């Protein structure tokens, strides 16, 4: 009722309160970033053709091979707006460095509440240095999550994820320069084709420049279970 | 099992022993194969996971490779403490799967001369044929290292239906022994024209044979 | 709306002393206060957000608290860029209100007018009017008043004045007043003066000019 | 680093309307929180209304039904428009981002950062006329020094700057607020102080310029017999 | 350190069933799933199946016939095995291990105990392994369906010790026992020389001495 601007009511749901949310925010290179977890249809994609130019298709790639192996990503200060991006290995990532819901995917979206470090659910809006977020993780069916994705305090989009493949590094499905290189086997986050990314609320936050993707709904599958889920590609 | 190993390998302290272990083209060929050792009486431990990489805390010694349908482990500088189950695993994806296990291999450091086995089979009694039961006991003994492997046959086709193994034991007072009961009607018995009891040690196959 | 006030309205200070002004509001605002600084010239610029924080570089010496219905903005060992007017404002409605300011000034050895009287041209006598000027020059305080007398008559209306603001380097004020006259009026008249009353002066000072010579 | 650039100065009769704009750039959304604020001159700063990306307004009761604000995302630009003027407004109008700028505690704060430049609005029944400038001459100086000014006399709008040879004079010039005659017309002098024994000798002259008009006089200023 | 440990040892009838703990700790519990494996003593490793602590996904051995069943519990760090309808070669040692993608089935438990045995105590029966026809010939005695351990066999009440093997027991289908003893004799002393072994399985009190004579 008091302080009008608090509205980011738009289905962060999964999470027991909204004061389970980690909202450290700074922009302090006034950009208007920030403002994107309130307005959602704002982008300023102007820069963004040129931004994923940088990106490079799956073409640049060759088919033999056939030893897969898996890698530790690099986790460059790239932002992870490439698919190709290499996540670091999920981890224990404290709460004071980030802002607004933080995703993981089964490859269906999926939110994640800041805990004890324990891991008991903390209702701390993310200030003490005792709420973190628990992020390590193993691949499904046996795991929990391919990876997740969220928001710096200062407006970038960080990415933690299961090693990709190698052989050459493919953490996302690319089927065409290897038959084993499924997404269920290299799939490290959001990403499950170099050209379609999961849909969930807050994809055009954390990926802002895939504004036009078209969103379809799909069906994926991981060791035989079937996840209906929407996904967003070009 | 559906990745076959040898059961047995040997090696005198401070060789290399290998292990071989095949497969298909949905396991091996395909996926990632890992090692156990496992003690008797311990649960297994495990040594290579991923084809080729020891966890922290293995000996360097201990090695893996793999290629097409069929993967080994390597143990240099073979010492009393290797002595050992070691079981290969692999994922796999045809019907078989997900996970699959090696048979075991037993590796004996080689601590006492290698010895072949000594065998009899005993038809079974007439009193106990009389008392509607039949039992062929087969008995084995001598034998260094001490793994065997005995296969029933029944008129020249298999039947492991039916059949116990005791553990071989080395308390032959010298080396391991072990005994093999197959177990019947005695319908059965005086139908096939003979039973046999197929016993192999280290690649070495001794079989007596009895009839009614 | 919802009303917020500023205490003191104005001050002056030595460069040094430590300086406070308060906000105060209406309704409770939690720590919804933000401190914006005008200097002449120029449009404000931020200071303090969130009640206590400054914007990413301002000099420590700045220093806001509060918290509900009374804030306190504090400037502890004043410096020669401090010189301004200070708003603070709510942001806490989302209609935003100011309020209505503080002036923070030099305070400086009180130092005397030096007066000049200025007869109007003859190139803007031959129009309709004549302007007569008096100039009062780097005085502090500020507090000055001018008088304009015309053969001894003092005059009411016919004169508008405007003062500086204090001066960068000497911390001083200086004032113009005009006292304007038809053409036909002034060459009635002969004898023109301006009588200057400051602080300053320890008895009033007049400048004139007789309309000959 | 979002950046507002805001519409020239404008001069309206009372009664009419002035539509002011604020085209935004350099920064992440199409459109931001802009919000609009006044300052009559010498006055404090009169918050009048807002309007958040989304394109929802808000206004002051000070000033409802008189101002409306409207956005254009085309452009990135939006507009202040505030009818039935009256003198009581003239005003340097300010743009401003009020952002949402920083998330704590389970609040969020928005504060304002760019500041557009401002644009002023004269509104008066006056009509644009240039400066007659004249020498305030120096007479007879004491104090070992001299003052000395010119007089930039019945113009409209506001402002009028002035320099003294050219810029290369700065030190002791004092140029005085304009004042606002009775005709409607405004009017400012400004003096320096030079040292007496370079009168006759040093050139003085002042540069006026009134941009309104597109006026410029550079007036020589001698002591008279 | 990362940590199985699993519950106690027990003994089950027939057609009882049995649940199986195991405790997780040093790890993210859900991070990775949960396997079960158990190995019949003497034999190699059997996969019985998997569950995902996170999502619960379950893959179970198809032989068990849906018989398993397995679960989680996440405050508690423990994972259940759950096997119905147990039947005599679900003796086993059963295992809990950890399985991820990568790593396998990397990190295992100490193994919990399950026998099911309705076995009381039952005297052994007794038959004659008798010589059949270069001048060394074997006999010996079968000792066959007898439980608790051990039973004891002599040959002409220790008269007769060289030549005589008796062999560790078996623990069969039924959860009874059997061995066999056995001596090397001269072919020349058949028909001359007589043999009697003599078991005793004291648990029973049961004493039998059988003579071994060539059919
Ligand atoms: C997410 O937010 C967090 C906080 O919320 C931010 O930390 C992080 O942003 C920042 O990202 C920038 C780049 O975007 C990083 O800048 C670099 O920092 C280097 C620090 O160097 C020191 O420490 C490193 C190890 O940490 C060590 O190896 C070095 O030897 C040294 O001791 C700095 O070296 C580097 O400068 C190099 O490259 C510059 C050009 O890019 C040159 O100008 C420079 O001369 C030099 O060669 C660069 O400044 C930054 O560290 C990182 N953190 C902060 C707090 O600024 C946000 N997100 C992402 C995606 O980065
Ligand atoms: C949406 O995003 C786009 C891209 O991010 C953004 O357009 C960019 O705006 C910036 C700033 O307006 C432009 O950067 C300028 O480029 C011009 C090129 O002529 C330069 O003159 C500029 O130099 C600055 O500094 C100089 C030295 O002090 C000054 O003399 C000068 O006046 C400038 O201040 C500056 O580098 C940038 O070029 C564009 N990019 C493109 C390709 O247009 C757009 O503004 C955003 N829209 C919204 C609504 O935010
Ligand atoms: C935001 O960052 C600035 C410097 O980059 C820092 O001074 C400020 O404290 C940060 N936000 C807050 C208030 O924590
Ligand atoms: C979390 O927010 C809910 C909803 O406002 C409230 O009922 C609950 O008590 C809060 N808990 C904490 C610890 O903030
Ligand atoms: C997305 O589509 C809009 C509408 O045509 C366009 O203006 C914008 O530039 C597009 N952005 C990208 C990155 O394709
Ligand atoms: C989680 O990950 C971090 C680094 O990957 C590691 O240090 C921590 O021990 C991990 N937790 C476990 C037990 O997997």
Redesign the pocket.
């Given at each position: 009722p008091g302080a009008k601007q608090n509205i980011q009511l738009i289905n962060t749901n999964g999470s027991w309160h909204l004061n389970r949310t980690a909202l450290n925010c700074?922009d302090s290179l006034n950009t208007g970033w920030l403002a994107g977890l309130f307005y959602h249809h704002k982008f300023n994609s102007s820069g963004c053709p040129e931004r994923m130019a940088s990106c490079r298709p799956l073409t640049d790639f060759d088919q033999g091979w056939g030893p897969i192996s898996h890698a530790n990503g690099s986790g460059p200060?790239?932002?992870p707006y490439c698919w190709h991006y290499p996540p670091r290995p999920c981890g224990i990532v404290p709460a004071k460095?980030v802002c607004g819901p933080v995703y993981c995917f089964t490859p269906s979206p999926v939110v994640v509440g800041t805990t004890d470090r324990a891991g008991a659910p903390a209702y701390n809006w993310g200030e003490n240095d005792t709420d973190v977020f628990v992020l390590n993780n193993t691949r499904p069916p046996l795991g929990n999550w391919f990876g997740c994705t969220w928001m710096?305090?200062?407006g970038?989009?960080?990415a933690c994820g299961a090693p990709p493949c190698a052989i050459l590094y493919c953490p996302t499905d690319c089927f065409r320069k290897h038959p084993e290189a499924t997404y269920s086997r290299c799939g490290s986050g959001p990403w499950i084709t170099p050209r379609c990314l999961v849909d969930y609320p807050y994809r055009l936050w954390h990926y802002p420049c895939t504004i036009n993707y078209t969103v379809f709904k799909i069906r994926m599958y991981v060791g035989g279970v079937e996840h209906r889920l929407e996904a967003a590609c070009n | 099992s559906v990745l076959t190993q040898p059961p047995s390998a040997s090696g005198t302290p401070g060789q290399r022993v290998t292990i071989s272990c095949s497969g298909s083209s949905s396991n091996i060929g395909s996926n990632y194969v890992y090692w156990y050792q496992q003690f008797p009486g311990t649960a297994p431990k495990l040594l290579i996971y991923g084809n080729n990489q020891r966890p922290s805390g293995v000996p360097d010694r201990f090695s893996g490779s793999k290629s097409g349908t069929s993967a080994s482990l390597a143990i240099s500088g073979l010492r009393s403490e290797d002595e050992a189950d070691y079981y290969c695993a692999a994922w796999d994806d045809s019907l078989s799967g997900p996970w699959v296990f090696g048979g075991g291999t037993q590796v004996t450091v080689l601590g006492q001369p290698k010895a072949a086995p000594s065998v009899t089979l005993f038809p079974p009694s007439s009193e106990e044929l009389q008392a509607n039961k039949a039992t062929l006991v087969c008995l084995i003994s001598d034998f260094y290292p001490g793994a065997v492997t005995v296969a029933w046959k029944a008129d020249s086709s298999p039947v492991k239906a039916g059949v116990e193994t005791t553990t071989p034991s080395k308390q032959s007072n010298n080396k391991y022994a072990a005994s093999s009961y197959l177990s019947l009607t005695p319908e059965q018995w005086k139908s096939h024209r003979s039973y046999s009891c197929q016993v192999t040690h280290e690649g070495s196959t001794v079989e007596k044979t009895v009839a009614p | 709306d919802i009303q917020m006030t500023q205490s003191p309205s104005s001050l002056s200070a030595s460069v040094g002393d430590r300086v406070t002004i308060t906000c105060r509001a209406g309704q409770n605002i939690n720590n919804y206060l933000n401190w914006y600084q005008q200097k002449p010239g120029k449009a404000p610029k931020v200071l303090i957000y969130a009640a206590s924080n400054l914007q990413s570089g301002v000099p420590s010496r700045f220093s806001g608290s509060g918290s509900g219905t009374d804030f306190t903005l504090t400037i502890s060992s004043l410096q020669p860029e401090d010189f301004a007017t200070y708003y603070c404002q709510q942001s806490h409605s989302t209609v935003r209100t100011f309020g209505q300011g503080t002036k923070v000034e030099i305070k400086r050895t009180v130092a005397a007018p030096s007066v000049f009287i200025f007869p109007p041209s003859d190139e803007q006598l031959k129009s309709g009017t004549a302007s007569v000027v008096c100039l009062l020059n780097n005085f502090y305080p500020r507090e000055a008043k001018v008088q304009w007398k015309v053969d001894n008559a003092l005059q009411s209306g016919n004169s508008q004045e405007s003062v500086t603001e204090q001066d960068s380097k000497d911390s001083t004020y200086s004032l113009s007043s005009t006292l304007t006259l038809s053409k036909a009026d002034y060459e009635k008249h002969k004898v023109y003066a301006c009588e200057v009353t400051h602080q300053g002066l320890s008895s009033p000072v007049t400048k004139s000019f007789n309309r000959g010579e | 680093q979002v950046q507002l650039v805001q519409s020239g100065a404008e001069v309206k009769k009372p009664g009419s309307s002035v539509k002011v704009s604020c085209k935004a750039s350099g920064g992440t959304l199409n459109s931001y929180e802009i919000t609009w604020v006044r300052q009559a001159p010498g006055q404090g700063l009169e918050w009048m209304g807002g309007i958040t990306p989304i394109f929802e307004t808000t206004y002051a009761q000070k000033f409802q039904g008189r101002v409306t604000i409207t956005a254009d995302e085309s452009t990135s630009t939006t507009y202040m428009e505030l009818s039935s003027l009256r003198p009581e407004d003239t005003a340097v109008y300010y743009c401003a981002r009020d952002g949402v700028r920083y998330c704590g505690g389970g609040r969020c704060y928005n504060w304002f950062d760019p500041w557009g430049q401002g644009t002023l609005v004269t509104v008066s029944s006056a009509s644009t006329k240039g400066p007659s400038v004249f020498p305030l001459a120096p007479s007879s100086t004491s104090g070992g020094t001299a003052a000395l000014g010119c007089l930039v006399k019945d113009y409209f709008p506001e402002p009028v700057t002035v320099s003294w040879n050219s810029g290369a004079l700065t030190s002791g010039v004092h140029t005085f607020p304009a004042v606002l005659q009775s005709s409607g017309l405004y009017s400012l002098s400004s003096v320096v102080t030079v040292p007496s024994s370079s009168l006759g000798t040093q050139t003085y002259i002042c540069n006026v310029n009134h941009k309104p008009s597109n006026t410029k006089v550079d007036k020589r200023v001698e002591p008279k017999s």
């Amino acid at each position: 009722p008091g302080a009008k601007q608090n509205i980011q009511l738009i289905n962060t749901n999964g999470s027991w309160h909204l004061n389970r949310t980690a909202l450290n925010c700074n922009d302090s290179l006034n950009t208007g970033w920030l403002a994107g977890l309130f307005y959602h249809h704002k982008f300023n994609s102007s820069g963004c053709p040129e931004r994923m130019a940088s990106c490079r298709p799956l073409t640049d790639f060759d088919q033999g091979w056939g030893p897969i192996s898996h890698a530790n990503g690099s986790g460059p200060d790239q932002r992870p707006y490439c698919w190709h991006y290499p996540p670091r290995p999920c981890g224990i990532v404290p709460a004071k460095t980030v802002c607004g819901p933080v995703y993981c995917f089964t490859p269906s979206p999926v939110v994640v509440g800041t805990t004890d470090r324990a891991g008991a659910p903390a209702y701390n809006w993310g200030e003490n240095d005792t709420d973190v977020f628990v992020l390590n993780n193993t691949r499904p069916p046996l795991g929990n999550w391919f990876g997740c994705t969220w928001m710096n305090s200062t407006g970038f989009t960080k990415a933690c994820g299961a090693p990709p493949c190698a052989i050459l590094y493919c953490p996302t499905d690319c089927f065409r320069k290897h038959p084993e290189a499924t997404y269920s086997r290299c799939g490290s986050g959001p990403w499950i084709t170099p050209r379609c990314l999961v849909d969930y609320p807050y994809r055009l936050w954390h990926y802002p420049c895939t504004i036009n993707y078209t969103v379809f709904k799909i069906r994926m599958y991981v060791g035989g279970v079937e996840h209906r889920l929407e996904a967003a590609c070009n | 099992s559906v990745l076959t190993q040898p059961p047995s390998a040997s090696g005198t302290p401070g060789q290399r022993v290998t292990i071989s272990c095949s497969g298909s083209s949905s396991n091996i060929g395909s996926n990632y194969v890992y090692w156990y050792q496992q003690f008797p009486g311990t649960a297994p431990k495990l040594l290579i996971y991923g084809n080729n990489q020891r966890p922290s805390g293995v000996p360097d010694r201990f090695s893996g490779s793999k290629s097409g349908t069929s993967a080994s482990l390597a143990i240099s500088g073979l010492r009393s403490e290797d002595e050992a189950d070691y079981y290969c695993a692999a994922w796999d994806d045809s019907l078989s799967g997900p996970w699959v296990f090696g048979g075991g291999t037993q590796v004996t450091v080689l601590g006492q001369p290698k010895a072949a086995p000594s065998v009899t089979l005993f038809p079974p009694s007439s009193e106990e044929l009389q008392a509607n039961k039949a039992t062929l006991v087969c008995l084995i003994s001598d034998f260094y290292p001490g793994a065997v492997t005995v296969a029933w046959k029944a008129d020249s086709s298999p039947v492991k239906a039916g059949v116990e193994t005791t553990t071989p034991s080395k308390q032959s007072n010298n080396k391991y022994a072990a005994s093999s009961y197959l177990s019947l009607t005695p319908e059965q018995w005086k139908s096939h024209r003979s039973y046999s009891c197929q016993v192999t040690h280290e690649g070495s196959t001794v079989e007596k044979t009895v009839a009614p | 709306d919802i009303q917020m006030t500023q205490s003191p309205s104005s001050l002056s200070a030595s460069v040094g002393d430590r300086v406070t002004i308060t906000c105060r509001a209406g309704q409770n605002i939690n720590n919804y206060l933000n401190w914006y600084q005008q200097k002449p010239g120029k449009a404000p610029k931020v200071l303090i957000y969130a009640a206590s924080n400054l914007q990413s570089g301002v000099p420590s010496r700045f220093s806001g608290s509060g918290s509900g219905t009374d804030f306190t903005l504090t400037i502890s060992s004043l410096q020669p860029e401090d010189f301004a007017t200070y708003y603070c404002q709510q942001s806490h409605s989302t209609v935003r209100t100011f309020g209505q300011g503080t002036k923070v000034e030099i305070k400086r050895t009180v130092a005397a007018p030096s007066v000049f009287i200025f007869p109007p041209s003859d190139e803007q006598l031959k129009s309709g009017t004549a302007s007569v000027v008096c100039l009062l020059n780097n005085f502090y305080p500020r507090e000055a008043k001018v008088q304009w007398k015309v053969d001894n008559a003092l005059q009411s209306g016919n004169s508008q004045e405007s003062v500086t603001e204090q001066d960068s380097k000497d911390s001083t004020y200086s004032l113009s007043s005009t006292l304007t006259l038809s053409k036909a009026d002034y060459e009635k008249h002969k004898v023109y003066a301006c009588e200057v009353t400051h602080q300053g002066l320890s008895s009033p000072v007049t400048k004139s000019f007789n309309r000959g010579e | 680093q979002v950046q507002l650039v805001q519409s020239g100065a404008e001069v309206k009769k009372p009664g009419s309307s002035v539509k002011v704009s604020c085209k935004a750039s350099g920064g992440t959304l199409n459109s931001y929180e802009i919000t609009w604020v006044r300052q009559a001159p010498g006055q404090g700063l009169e918050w009048m209304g807002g309007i958040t990306p989304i394109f929802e307004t808000t206004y002051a009761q000070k000033f409802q039904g008189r101002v409306t604000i409207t956005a254009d995302e085309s452009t990135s630009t939006t507009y202040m428009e505030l009818s039935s003027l009256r003198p009581e407004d003239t005003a340097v109008y300010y743009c401003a981002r009020d952002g949402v700028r920083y998330c704590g505690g389970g609040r969020c704060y928005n504060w304002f950062d760019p500041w557009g430049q401002g644009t002023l609005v004269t509104v008066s029944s006056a009509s644009t006329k240039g400066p007659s400038v004249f020498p305030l001459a120096p007479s007879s100086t004491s104090g070992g020094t001299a003052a000395l000014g010119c007089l930039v006399k019945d113009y409209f709008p506001e402002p009028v700057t002035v320099s003294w040879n050219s810029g290369a004079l700065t030190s002791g010039v004092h140029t005085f607020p304009a004042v606002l005659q009775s005709s409607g017309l405004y009017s400012l002098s400004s003096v320096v102080t030079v040292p007496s024994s370079s009168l006759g000798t040093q050139t003085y002259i002042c540069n006026v310029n009134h941009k309104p008009s597109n006026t410029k006089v550079d007036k020589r200023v001698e002591p008279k017999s």
